[PDB]
Design an enzyme around this catalytic site. Sequence first.
Site, PDB file in Angstrom:
ATOM      1  N   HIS A  60       0.274   1.555  15.612  1.00  0.00           N
ATOM      2  CA  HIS A  60       0.413   1.712  13.737  1.00  0.00           C
ATOM      3  C   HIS A  60       0.562   1.009  13.542  1.00  0.00           C
ATOM      4  O   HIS A  60       0.880   0.759  12.206  1.00  0.00           O
ATOM      5  CB  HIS A  60       1.099   3.564  14.392  1.00  0.00           C
ATOM      6  CG  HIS A  60       0.299   4.201  14.867  1.00  0.00           C
ATOM      7  ND1 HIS A  60      -1.301   4.920  15.293  1.00  0.00           N
ATOM      8  CD2 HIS A  60       0.844   5.429  15.842  1.00  0.00           C
ATOM      9  CE1 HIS A  60      -1.400   5.295  16.091  1.00  0.00           C
ATOM     10  NE2 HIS A  60      -0.537   5.491  16.619  1.00  0.00           N
ATOM     11  N   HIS A  68      10.485   0.582  11.805  1.00  0.00           N
ATOM     12  CA  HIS A  68       9.221  -0.177  11.765  1.00  0.00           C
ATOM     13  C   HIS A  68       9.170  -0.210  10.142  1.00  0.00           C
ATOM     14  O   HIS A  68       9.475  -0.207   9.391  1.00  0.00           O
ATOM     15  CB  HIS A  68       8.369   0.988  11.517  1.00  0.00           C
ATOM     16  CG  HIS A  68       7.883   2.341  11.406  1.00  0.00           C
ATOM     17  ND1 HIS A  68       8.811   3.991  11.413  1.00  0.00           N
ATOM     18  CD2 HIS A  68       7.366   2.821   9.746  1.00  0.00           C
ATOM     19  CE1 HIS A  68       8.600   4.854  10.251  1.00  0.00           C
ATOM     20  NE2 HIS A  68       7.684   3.759   9.661  1.00  0.00           N
ATOM     21  N   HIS A  97       5.512  -1.367   7.409  1.00  0.00           N
ATOM     22  CA  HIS A  97       3.641  -1.077   6.727  1.00  0.00           C
ATOM     23  C   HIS A  97       4.388  -2.469   6.088  1.00  0.00           C
ATOM     24  O   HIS A  97       4.931  -3.056   5.343  1.00  0.00           O
ATOM     25  CB  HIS A  97       3.785   0.199   5.882  1.00  0.00           C
ATOM     26  CG  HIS A  97       4.625   1.414   6.824  1.00  0.00           C
ATOM     27  ND1 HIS A  97       3.143   2.257   7.455  1.00  0.00           N
ATOM     28  CD2 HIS A  97       5.471   1.887   6.777  1.00  0.00           C
ATOM     29  CE1 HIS A  97       4.491   3.421   7.786  1.00  0.00           C
ATOM     30  NE2 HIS A  97       5.178   2.781   7.291  1.00  0.00           N
ATOM     31  N   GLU A 108       4.275   1.453   0.968  1.00  0.00           N
ATOM     32  CA  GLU A 108       3.328   2.967   0.532  1.00  0.00           C
ATOM     33  C   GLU A 108       4.158   3.290  -0.502  1.00  0.00           C
ATOM     34  O   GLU A 108       3.061   4.418  -1.033  1.00  0.00           O
ATOM     35  CB  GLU A 108       4.324   3.589   1.788  1.00  0.00           C
ATOM     36  CG  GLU A 108       3.598   2.789   3.337  1.00  0.00           C
ATOM     37  CD  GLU A 108       3.454   4.216   4.427  1.00  0.00           C
ATOM     38  OE1 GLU A 108       4.405   4.891   4.816  1.00  0.00           O
ATOM     39  OE2 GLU A 108       2.088   4.136   4.897  1.00  0.00           O
ATOM     40  N   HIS A 151      10.861   1.636   7.210  1.00  0.00           N
ATOM     41  CA  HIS A 151      10.905   2.044   7.367  1.00  0.00           C
ATOM     42  C   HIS A 151      12.772   2.674   8.049  1.00  0.00           C
ATOM     43  O   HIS A 151      12.055   2.570   9.632  1.00  0.00           O
ATOM     44  CB  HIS A 151      10.711   3.164   7.425  1.00  0.00           C
ATOM     45  CG  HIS A 151       9.517   3.821   5.881  1.00  0.00           C
ATOM     46  ND1 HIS A 151       8.141   4.625   6.006  1.00  0.00           N
ATOM     47  CD2 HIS A 151       9.464   2.885   4.962  1.00  0.00           C
ATOM     48  CE1 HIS A 151       7.731   4.412   5.207  1.00  0.00           C
ATOM     49  NE2 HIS A 151       8.049   3.303   4.320  1.00  0.00           N
ATOM     50  N   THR A 189       4.998   9.995   6.722  1.00  0.00           N
ATOM     51  CA  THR A 189       3.654   9.284   6.174  1.00  0.00           C
ATOM     52  C   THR A 189       2.117   8.978   6.674  1.00  0.00           C
ATOM     53  O   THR A 189       1.750   8.543   7.080  1.00  0.00           O
ATOM     54  CB  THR A 189       3.946   8.108   5.486  1.00  0.00           C
ATOM     55  OG1 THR A 189       4.548   7.230   6.409  1.00  0.00           O
ATOM     56  CG2 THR A 189       5.627   8.681   4.569  1.00  0.00           C
TER      57      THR A 189
HETATM   58  C1  LIG Z   1       3.679   6.731  14.385  1.00  0.00           C
HETATM   59  C2  LIG Z   1       4.260   7.864  13.375  1.00  0.00           C
HETATM   60  N1  LIG Z   1       5.520   8.315  14.286  1.00  0.00           N
HETATM   61  C3  LIG Z   1       5.769   9.195  13.092  1.00  0.00           C
HETATM   62  C4  LIG Z   1       6.754  11.007  13.898  1.00  0.00           C
HETATM   63  C5  LIG Z   1       7.891  10.145  14.856  1.00  0.00           C
HETATM   64  C6  LIG Z   1       8.217  10.827  15.726  1.00  0.00           C
HETATM   65  S1  LIG Z   1       9.251  10.283  13.249  1.00  0.00           S
HETATM   66  O1  LIG Z   1      10.260   8.333  14.189  1.00  0.00           O
HETATM   67  O2  LIG Z   1       9.473  10.914  12.763  1.00  0.00           O
HETATM   68  C7  LIG Z   1       8.021   8.572  12.014  1.00  0.00           C
HETATM   69  S2  LIG Z   1       8.739   8.773  10.824  1.00  0.00           S
HETATM   70  C8  LIG Z   1       6.851   8.227  10.426  1.00  0.00           C
HETATM   71  S3  LIG Z   1       7.209   7.678   8.340  1.00  0.00           S
HETATM   72  N2  LIG Z   1       5.814   7.023   7.533  1.00  0.00           N
HETATM   73  O3  LIG Z   1       7.460   9.106   7.498  1.00  0.00           O
HETATM   74  O4  LIG Z   1       8.946   6.605   7.935  1.00  0.00           O
HETATM   75  C9  LIG Z   1       6.607   8.272  10.939  1.00  0.00           C
HETATM   76  C10 LIG Z   1       6.941   8.696  12.000  1.00  0.00           C
HETATM   77 ZN   LIG Z   2       6.804   4.555   8.006  1.00  0.00          ZN
END
Ligand SMILES: CCN[C@H]1C[C@H](C)S(=O)(=O)c2sc(S(N)(=O)=O)cc21
Ligand SMILES: [Zn+2]
Length: 249
Positions: free
Chosen positions: A64, A91, A93, A103, A116, A190
């Site tokens: 992703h 990570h 986007h 985002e 992020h 998100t």
């Molecule tokens: C692949 C998505 N992973 C999820 C679950 C992971 C456990 S996490 O670190 O809580 C996390 S932080 C975001 S974001 N885009 O809102 O920053 C998404 C995700």
């Molecule tokens: Zn994110």
Amino acid sequence: WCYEVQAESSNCLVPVKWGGNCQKDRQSPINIVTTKAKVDKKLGRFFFSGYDKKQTWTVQNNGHSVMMLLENKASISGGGLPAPYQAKQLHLHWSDLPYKGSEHSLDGEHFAMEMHIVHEKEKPEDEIAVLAFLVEAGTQVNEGFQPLVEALSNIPKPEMSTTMAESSLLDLLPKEEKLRHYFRYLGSLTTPTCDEKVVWTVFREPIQLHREQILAFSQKLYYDKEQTVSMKDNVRPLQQLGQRTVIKS
Ligand SMILES: CCN[C@H]1C[C@H](C)S(=O)(=O)c2sc(S(N)(=O)=O)cc21
Ligand SMILES: [Zn+2]
């Protein structure tokens, strides 16, 4: 689950059909109308711990995004937060076009990427604190991003992992003086399961990367182990603010 872009070339659940909490009322991301955000004097400076230390980070393609594993080696406090938060992962986007890679948006303006930095509360609507930085093309190579950009060709496929050359989290951020101005609200993850447990911070000051560094992401990374779908447009559509407000420092 997948992004809209992946459905067109799938060998999956698109964002408007995501289940879990994704169809609820306090979701992210949002458009921030800056003049409608009220100044809150309690939103003080952030204080960073372990962001200055050089580490060799593990970075992985999770299908992703690309994600650095921070393994609790850094933390934050201040920033109006109730407690310190441990750093878990970082990570991004992105797209391959300048106004469809973020985002969040600011007054309707979108950016080329959004980074992020994900942290967890040390001890709820604020179990997770995400630090969000908006990215645009500038005039120069951002040297701080080079270890990450350089690692990308070693994780072209989902599930692959590699080790970055020595680098700090500080190397990725704006000057600390420029982190004093940010936006704050309560929302969600998100991606599925979209849990409403995130306290968001969106910094006003954009990071600048060279065009070629931003394009590296979509040029070197893939959504699929067959390497037929380039990783880009991993962006959740904008959600409605509703009865929440945004506050600012
Ligand atoms: C692949 C998505 N992973 C999820 C679950 C992971 C456990 S996490 O670190 O809580 C996390 S932080 C975001 S974001 N885009 O809102 O920053 C998404 C995700
Ligand atoms: Zn994110």
